[PDB]
Amino acid sequence: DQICIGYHANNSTEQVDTIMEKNVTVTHAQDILEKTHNGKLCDLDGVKPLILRDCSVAGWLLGNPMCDEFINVPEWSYIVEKANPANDLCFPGNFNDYEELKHLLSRINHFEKIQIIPKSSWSDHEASSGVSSACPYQGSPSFFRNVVWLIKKNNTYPTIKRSYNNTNQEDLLVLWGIHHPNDAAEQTRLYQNPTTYISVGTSTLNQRLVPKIATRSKVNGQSGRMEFFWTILKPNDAINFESNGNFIAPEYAYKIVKKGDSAIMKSELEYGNCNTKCQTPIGAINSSMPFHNIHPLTIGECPKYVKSNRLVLATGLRNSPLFGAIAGFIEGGWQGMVDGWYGYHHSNEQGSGYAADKESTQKAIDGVTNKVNSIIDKMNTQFEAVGREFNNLERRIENLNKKMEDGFLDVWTYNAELLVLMENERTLDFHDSNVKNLYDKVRLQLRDNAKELGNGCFEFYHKCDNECMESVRNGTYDYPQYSEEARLKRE
Amino acid sequence: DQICIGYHANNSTEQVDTIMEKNVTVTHAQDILEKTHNGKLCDLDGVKPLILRDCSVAGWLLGNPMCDEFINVPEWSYIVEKANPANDLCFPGNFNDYEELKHLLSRINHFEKIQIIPKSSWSDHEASSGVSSACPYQGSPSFFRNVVWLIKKNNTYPTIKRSYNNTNQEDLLVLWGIHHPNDAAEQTRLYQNPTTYISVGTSTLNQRLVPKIATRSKVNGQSGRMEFFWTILKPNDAINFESNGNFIAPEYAYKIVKKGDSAIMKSELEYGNCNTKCQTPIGAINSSMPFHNIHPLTIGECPKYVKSNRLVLATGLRNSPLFGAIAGFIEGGWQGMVDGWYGYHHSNEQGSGYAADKESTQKAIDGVTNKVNSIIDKMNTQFEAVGREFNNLERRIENLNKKMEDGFLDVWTYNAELLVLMENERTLDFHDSNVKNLYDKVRLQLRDNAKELGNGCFEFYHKCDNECMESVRNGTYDYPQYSEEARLKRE
Amino acid sequence: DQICIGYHANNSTEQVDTIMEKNVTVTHAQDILEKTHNGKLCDLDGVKPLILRDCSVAGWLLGNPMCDEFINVPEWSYIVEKANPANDLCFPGNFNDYEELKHLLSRINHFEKIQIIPKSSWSDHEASSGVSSACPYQGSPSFFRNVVWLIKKNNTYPTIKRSYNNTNQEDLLVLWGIHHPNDAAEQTRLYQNPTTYISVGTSTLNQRLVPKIATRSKVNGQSGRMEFFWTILKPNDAINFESNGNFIAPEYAYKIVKKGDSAIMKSELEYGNCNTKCQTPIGAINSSMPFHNIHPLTIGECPKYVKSNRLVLATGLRNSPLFGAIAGFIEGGWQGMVDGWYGYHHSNEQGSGYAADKESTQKAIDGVTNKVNSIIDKMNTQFEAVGREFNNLERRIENLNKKMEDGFLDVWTYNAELLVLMENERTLDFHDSNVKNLYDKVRLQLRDNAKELGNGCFEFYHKCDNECMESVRNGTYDYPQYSEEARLKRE
Ligand SMILES: *[C@@H]1O[C@H](CO)[C@@H](O[C@@H]2O[C@H](CO)[C@@H](O)[C@H](O)[C@H]2NC(C)=O)[C@H](O)[C@H]1NC(C)=O
Ligand SMILES: *[C@@H]1O[C@H](CO)[C@@H](O[C@@H]2O[C@H](CO)[C@@H](O)[C@H](O)[C@H]2NC(C)=O)[C@H](O)[C@H]1NC(C)=O
Ligand SMILES: *[C@@H]1O[C@H](CO)[C@@H](O[C@@H]2O[C@H](CO)[C@@H](O)[C@H](O)[C@H]2NC(C)=O)[C@H](O)[C@H]1NC(C)=O
Ligand SMILES: *[C@@H]1O[C@H](CO)[C@@H](O[C@@H]2O[C@H](CO)[C@@H](O)[C@H](O)[C@H]2NC(C)=O)[C@H](O)[C@H]1NC(C)=O
Ligand SMILES: *[C@@H]1O[C@H](CO)[C@@H](O[C@@H]2O[C@H](CO)[C@@H](O)[C@H](O)[C@H]2NC(C)=O)[C@H](O)[C@H]1NC(C)=O
Ligand SMILES: *[C@@H]1O[C@H](CO)[C@@H](O[C@@H]2O[C@H](CO)[C@@H](O)[C@H](O)[C@H]2NC(C)=O)[C@H](O)[C@H]1NC(C)=O
Ligand SMILES: *[C@@H]1O[C@H](CO)[C@@H](O)[C@H](O)[C@H]1NC(C)=O
Ligand SMILES: *[C@@H]1O[C@H](CO)[C@@H](O)[C@H](O)[C@H]1NC(C)=O
Ligand SMILES: *[C@@H]1O[C@H](CO)[C@@H](O)[C@H](O)[C@H]1NC(C)=O
Ligand SMILES: *[C@@H]1O[C@H](CO)[C@@H](O)[C@H](O)[C@H]1NC(C)=O
Ligand SMILES: *[C@@H]1O[C@H](CO)[C@@H](O)[C@H](O)[C@H]1NC(C)=O
Ligand SMILES: *[C@@H]1O[C@H](CO)[C@@H](O)[C@H](O)[C@H]1NC(C)=O
Ligand SMILES: *[C@@H]1O[C@H](CO)[C@@H](O)[C@H](O)[C@H]1NC(C)=O
Ligand SMILES: *[C@@H]1O[C@H](CO)[C@@H](O)[C@H](O)[C@H]1NC(C)=O
Ligand SMILES: *[C@@H]1O[C@H](CO)[C@@H](O)[C@H](O)[C@H]1NC(C)=O
Ligand SMILES: [Mg+2]
Ligand SMILES: [Mg+2]
Ligand SMILES: [Mg+2]
Ligand SMILES: [Mg+2]
Ligand SMILES: [Mg+2]
Ligand SMILES: [Mg+2]
Ligand SMILES: [Mg+2]
Ligand SMILES: [Mg+2]
Numbered sequence A, B, C: 001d002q003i004c005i006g007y008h009a010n011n012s013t014e015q016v017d018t019i020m021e022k023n024v025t026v027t028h029a030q031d032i033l034e035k036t037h038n039g040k041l042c043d044l045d046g047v048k049p050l051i052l053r054d055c056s057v058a059g060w061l062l063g064n065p066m067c068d069e070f071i072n073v074p075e076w077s078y079i080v081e082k083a084n085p086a087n088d089l090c091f092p093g094n095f096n097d098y099e100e101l102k103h104l105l106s107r108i109n110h111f112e113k114i115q116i117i118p119k120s121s122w123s124d125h126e127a128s129s130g131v132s133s134a135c136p137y138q139g140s141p142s143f144f145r146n147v148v149w150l151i152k153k154n155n156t157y158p159t160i161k162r163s164y165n166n167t168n169q170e171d172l173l174v175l176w177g178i179h180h181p182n183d184a185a186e187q188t189r190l191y192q193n194p195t196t197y198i199s200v201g202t203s204t205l206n207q208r209l210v211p212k213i214a215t216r217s218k219v220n221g222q223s224g225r226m227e228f229f230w231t232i233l234k235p236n237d238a239i240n241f242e243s244n245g246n247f248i249a250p251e252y253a254y255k256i257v258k259k260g261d262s263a264i265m266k267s268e269l270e271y272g273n274c275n276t277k278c279q280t281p282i283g284a285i286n287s288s289m290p291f292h293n294i295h296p297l298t299i300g301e302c303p304k305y306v307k308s309n310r311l312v313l314a315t316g317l318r319n320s321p322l323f324g325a326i327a328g329f330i331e332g333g334w335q336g337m338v339d340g341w342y343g344y345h346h347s348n349e350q351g352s353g354y355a356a357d358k359e360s361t362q363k364a365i366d367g368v369t370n371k372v373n374s375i376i377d378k379m380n381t382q383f384e385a386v387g388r389e390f391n392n393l394e395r396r397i398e399n400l401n402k403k404m405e406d407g408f409l410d411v412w413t414y415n416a417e418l419l420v421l422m423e424n425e426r427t428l429d430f431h432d433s434n435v436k437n438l439y440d441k442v443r444l445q446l447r448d449n450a451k452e453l454g455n456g457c458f459e460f461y462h463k464c465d466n467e468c469m470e471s472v473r474n475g476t477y478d479y480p481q482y483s484e485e486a487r488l489k490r491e
């Protein structure tokens, strides 16, 4: 008759890592790292993204004629611009403070376009003749639809004095522009005044623009240039224009009607016809994992991003092919014990089999489950990367922003990886200790009533029925009832 | 007669956390996290803060007339500005490079105001008539006291040529300004020259300002604007002004007399009449704790800021209501053992009581104390947040600065929390191991002379007096003297 | 006859630290921290650094006459500028966007200087008379060699219209400048036109400069100023100048011929005549260590920089002068056991000596080696600091960049230090556990055949020859063959 202490083994191949050993096979693991994505741009929680397919943000906001998909645009979840989209400023020039505007856009989900200075209301000043072949609409020359290019009416340009005063209670995005022509010939040909200005004044704005007349290498067919400016107008303020030439004038403005906090993603992808709660520039994520490795930029309810390739937690114990039990004086595990992690095996005149010591198994699974939840949550708060854009003379800042974004990504990846390494090692030792404590509980019930074999087994000197066995498993073993019989069986 | 191994228990309710178990009760803990603050603005190490109550920094430095608390200002420890203080630039306009000046101010504890270009010395140029109702002093119109608004004297404005050359050996903060009027009417009404300039030139400064004359939505009663500029003048340099109108001229300048490295705090609080060595925008800290959770911005000798809500270290052991002793084969602790952490209990014909195994207790308290000091100090060097201000077109930078400040705050909070979790678990196992080692020391002195009971106790076969007991506690137990008697008592 | 379990000890003094104990002596350690440097500026992987000894980058690029070491400059590995180098802009002025250009330079290893607008080709416009004593060449007045100071030819300055169109397929760095004179006298004395401009236009550039004529405190003998500008010209674009005075004109430009990604180091050092694979501003590094503490800025294949003063890993075990063996029931180590870490000592009628239990020793050294490699590599990816420069009105950004660089340096130093502390403690406990497991393997072979002494030793009841000893070391010990003899020897 003999009773044995041992542990669970199965046909698992799941491997884990520790500081001291790589590729150790465990009966049970738990992967915590999402590695796949649908590779599609999807609606975010129903709400469809504004995919400015070939248009740029500038070509959307000024109303490039090739951008007639976006003249009136529904509330979007996130915006998707290409890398080098074709339909940018079609008439050459620059957009002032472009990046700080894109930044404003990251925190806006709805514009309502409204007419503020109607095209007609220019009675002097021909306002239907500012038109260029650089900006063709269906074959014939055109211009940025939300702005009007004023030129001389009957060889005269009376100094303009106009004013708009914000209502709606919303904030209003207004845009305007100045023309830098190619030479004094065109200066007088178009506005006739040899030297002109534009004065824009709100409560917080005081500018005086003046056209830089110069010959320039022509791009897109044009040697002139168009400088554009923007501003946010408070719910009850006046914008107050004045100018005697070269004035590009606002016709339409944007109401900022809902500030719902989104992003501008750079992706070459097209819309994908899906919903998801988590989007990345290269695909969407459907996952309960606490971590992913898909892409640093996300939007939605998302896993924490880390740079690992595998992130697997041990939960079970070292699976047979620090303390003294597992793969120790107990050489291997019991394929035959399925109902628990640690337990007993008995042999006697009647029976032979396995009984898992539950409630020791159960204490183990509570500790492991707590461990895992504590890992999933202790990193609840990791660095979330955001997209920030910089122009060609902000290279220092852009580099600093890069080094910063990346330093945090590296730090959190180290943290996650090393936490999982250290806790895999502690978890395997925890199983080792639970098995050793069970063996040291069985030994000390039997003392001289059985021979301690050395391999986790106790050979009984007296004979031990299934009820005597179960008394040992119970922890209620009457040593004196077998004192006598065992004593005798000693020689 | 029986001797028992066991450990200390008390009536503590202090709880701690580990990775695997939450809310475990220990005989002794040590909280390391400050959670309270006096909620007052106090003198920092005696030195009283400059609380610009309703004034803004700009309204202090240019000398708004409503800011006549700060015309001559004593050395301050730290400065306290409100959020939207009423007494800013009372005559509308803007302050050039405002934030970079506030940044300079963060590293300055004393200004000495000195007159450099006295009001009188304008002999042409009426210098007592630049005055506005926008800036009222006690009912009647006034102006920024440290600067003088020059207007035409007898329908003439001779081009100004003035020069100041720094002495004192200190650095000097000089301020000036230009007026942008509302129309050409007021341009000639005040300076009479239809078109004017200001040229400011030091060794490192070469500027040409020109008034932007334009009609603007009037705020504070004024449709004109006042642009202000500043500069630091080296101890032996010349500032060298020239202008034919619209010149706001420096009368008083600041000597930077002591650069003692402080901050500008944003708080709505009023002075509190206290001293302290650590100040936050929402209250002061009196604490020996290594960490606090009061506020990220501090000044002084301060605890490290973390975002935790509780941060408690285990020092004692699991308190009764991995190795095999505590809450193991030894079911509970001894309320009756007060003089140590681990020890013995004996029963015999004479006595019954507890004796703490000191020097095992003492090795434990040295290890725990070292552990704690190493925790307190290994985080000696955490990220210290500073206040940085940005205007409405630096939103990208401000956001980057936010994400950065916060990423470090999150990383150090994770570090502290997880360090305390891991070391609480190791500390409890350390107590478990000390108890098991004591039991394995007592067993191996007695071998067959006593029956190993299973519950931390040894039932003696031979009889054992208080001196035999103390020989076992000592570690000097003569097995052969009782060989015989015990052998016999075996059956 | 007696067999004993024990462990290795030597005459090592190497100390390590753990969370609970400082200055513990181990048989074997491994320092992982480089602490020395040759204190020299060396060729980086053969490629010699451009050491602009007394010249500044500006004085190199515009061609200060005192900078005639750098008129034609070989491909460099890294650049070395002093702190306040004497030969900067010798004629006073400023260099526009200086820092963003230095930033461009950090990613460039070769310029090829080429003439684009030859000095002769000015036929009107005296182009050999722009010369100043501020910029002396060998006693007599001179000027920036790569740029030409055009002045009036025969009391006339016909408006300049020039154009260069990039070829070579490379990117081209072009430089130019404007003169701000001291008064209208010198304005007409030099260019004769009372009011002048410069218009620079590429595809992406549209500027109109205008000389600010003002009297200024003269430095270096000059009261005038020279503002310089730069730009990168795309491989097929036109730069297109026009101006009627005050024009400093490009003669030579730079081809960006190889973009090999380097740095600009600030050091007062001179070239040192050496090669190395790792350079710091204060010296070079020759080291296999994974970490160094020399300086944060490095270039090459370099160790990770941390701020520690010592970073030593335990590999061996606690060296004699948690589990129950080392410095426990086994009081000390065996100077006499050299061939392994753990082993046996035997005494009998024939022999007396030591036998290391190899393959237990070997399992230990595999685990320790893996531990160390995992430490060396898990921090493969640490923050690499880069040098970034800022001017006197970028103090906020510079401070943010400082706090950021430093926060990462502090975080990685904490990580390394605490990892080494925790793993030193685990490594010593790992040795403790290996010794205890060996003792618990020997005990359980012998059970009653030997008396368990208490000090790691087993006193045999039966007699045990070198072959019986080796059967115990083997793990193949026949208990029944000595059952009888030992039984008898019990009394
Ligand atoms: C234009 O902005 C002005 C302020 O410049 C607004 O003036 C207010 O108008 C309402 C009546 O419509 C009055 O109750 C307030 O007394 C006015 N405030 C001030 C300071 O005068 C005006 O409402 C705005 N008008 C439009 C069409 O936007
Ligand atoms: C502990 O284990 C034993 C049996 O494995 C249970 O003890 C009783 O044993 C006596 C004689 O040994 C029998 O007459 C009883 O019928 C057994 N009772 C039962 C309910 O099995 C004992 O109950 C176990 N303890 C617990 C809590 O289950
Ligand atoms: C004004 O700045 C000038 C330099 O522009 C200073 O000139 C020095 O004056 C002292 C005598 O007072 C002489 O010893 C030095 O030779 C002068 N240096 C130079 C370069 O000329 C002058 O001290 C300053 N004066 C004031 C009142 O501040
Ligand atoms: C170790 O413990 C014992 C007593 O608990 C001390 O040993 C001596 O015991 C003998 C007989 O057992 C007595 O005659 C002595 O008087 C005891 N001496 C003393 C000073 O108590 C022994 O001294 C203890 N060792 C130490 C260092 O205190
Ligand atoms: C100057 O830049 C122009 C474009 O402004 C280049 O023009 C091209 O020249 C080649 C022939 O030399 C032609 O094959 C292309 O058709 C031209 N492109 C265009 C848009 O016209 C020109 O090569 C450049 N010339 C120099 C000397 O750099
Ligand atoms: C295990 O250790 C023993 C000896 O230390 C080796 O066993 C044999 O012992 C018998 C009698 O005890 C001798 O007749 C043999 O000559 C021994 N054989 C050898 C090769 O030494 C035994 O071989 C050892 N096991 C291994 C794998 O080396
Ligand atoms: C196991 O071995 C090495 C790491 O030690 C690795 O190349 C390998 O991929 C790991 N196992 C499998 C099945 O990939
Ligand atoms: C203005 O237009 C009318 C016809 O509409 C014409 O009579 C007149 O001559 C024009 N004025 C000028 C300066 O050309
Ligand atoms: C994606 O997860 C969501 C649960 O939010 C659910 O719509 C769906 O079952 C998952 N898709 C697949 C293929 O499992
Ligand atoms: C103990 O239980 C939970 C955490 O498990 C928490 O809500 C509770 O506050 C903790 N105990 C006390 C006394 O607050
Ligand atoms: C200047 O003032 C005097 C009186 O002080 C007067 O005689 C003279 O006419 C004034 N000059 C002008 C242009 O008004
Ligand atoms: C605050 O701590 C300081 C010691 O620096 C001391 O003035 C004072 O005793 C403490 N205040 C209270 C209420 O304990
Ligand atoms: C050992 O003691 C302290 C740290 O506990 C330190 O001053 C000392 O330098 C360490 N040892 C040596 C040999 O330096
Ligand atoms: C131009 O130079 C020639 C001599 O080279 C001279 O005849 C002529 O007078 C000069 N023109 C002027 C305006 O000085
Ligand atoms: C420096 O290390 C390199 C190996 O890359 C080698 O040239 C040399 O042996 C080392 N120098 C010294 C003094 O050891
Ligand atoms: Mg088993
Ligand atoms: Mg198994
Ligand atoms: Mg696009
Ligand atoms: Mg066994
Ligand atoms: Mg107890
Ligand atoms: Mg207790
Ligand atoms: Mg205030
Ligand atoms: Mg017991």
Ligand SMILES: [Mg+2]
Pocket: C005, C006, C007, C008, C330, C332, C333, C334
């Ligand atoms: Mg030893």
Ligand SMILES: [Mg+2]
Pocket: C007, C008, C009, C010, C027, C317, C318, C319, C320, C332, C333, C334
């Ligand atoms: Mg040793």
Ligand SMILES: [Mg+2]
Pocket: C052, C053, C054, C055, C056, C080, C081, C082, C083, C085
């Ligand atoms: Mg130098």
Ligand SMILES: [Mg+2]
Pocket: C452, C453, C454, C455, C456, C457, C458
């Ligand atoms: Mg022993």
